[PDB]
């Protein structure tokens, strides 16, 4: 179903609050994003990890140069956090992603996997900044 | 759902500070920050 898959969808507004928070390769790795390719067609890709691009760009108020190593079945390349869209996974794009996964052979993640992964973002959002992370964030 | 927004001292940038947290700006890092105007009905009489 698309409604259940949209739960872990990392919109463009949420990613602005973890631009420098540690454990970014742990809480982010596992969720899906609606990266815009470009005309209105979108392709869902899996978050394999985290990379850093040599180009610095401004995203509204803040500004980040980190990239995002995504992959859609087999086709993989470097992307940016600025092309991500805030729209939810439509039926057509959901079917396209399912077909791409079936063709690539990657087993679809289990519903319990998504159920236990969606809580990661929720628990990270209310995380108290009691440790020595503000120094690194400001740096 | 009010995280008690504050205003940095010199940055004049908004910050979200919750209880049991250090008082510092999200960037640079200073130790001074003021509050924002209330949302109440501040109504004066031009007298």
């Amino acid at each position: 179903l698309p409604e259940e898959l949209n739960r872990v969808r990392l919109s463009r507004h949420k990613l602005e609050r973890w631009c420098h928070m540690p454990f970014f390769a742990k809480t982010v790795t596992g969720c899906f994003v609606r990266i815009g390719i470009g005309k209105p067609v979108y392709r869902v890709a899996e978050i394999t990890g985290v990379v850093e691009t040599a180009k610095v760009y401004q995203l509204g108020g803040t500004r980040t140069n980190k990239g995002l190593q995504l992959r859609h079945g087999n086709d993989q390349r470097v992307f940016r956090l600025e092309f991500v869209s805030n729209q939810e996974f439509t039926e057509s794009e959901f079917m396209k992603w399912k077909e791409a996964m079936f063709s690539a052979g990657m087993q679809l993640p289990t519903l319990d996997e998504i159920n236990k992964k969606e809580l990661s973002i929720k628990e990270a959002l209310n995380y108290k900044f009691n440790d020595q992370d503000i120094e690194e964030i400001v740096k | 759902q009010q995280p008690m927004i504050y205003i940095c001292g010199e940055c004049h940038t908004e910050n979200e500070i919750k209880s049991r947290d250090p008082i510092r700006c999200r960037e640079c890092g200073y130790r001074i920050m003021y509050k924002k105007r209330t949302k109440r009905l501040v109504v004066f009489d031009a007298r």
């Binding site: 507004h13 949420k14 990266i35 815009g36 390719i37 470009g38 092309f83 805030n86 | 759902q1």
Partner: peptide, 17 residues
């Protein structure tokens, strides 16, 4: 205050660049 999208702010594309 999770995501005040209200759509969005014109999301750029990859091939457009």
């Amino acid at each position: 205050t999770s995501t005040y999208g209200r759509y969005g702010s014109q999301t750029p594309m990859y091939g457009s660049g």
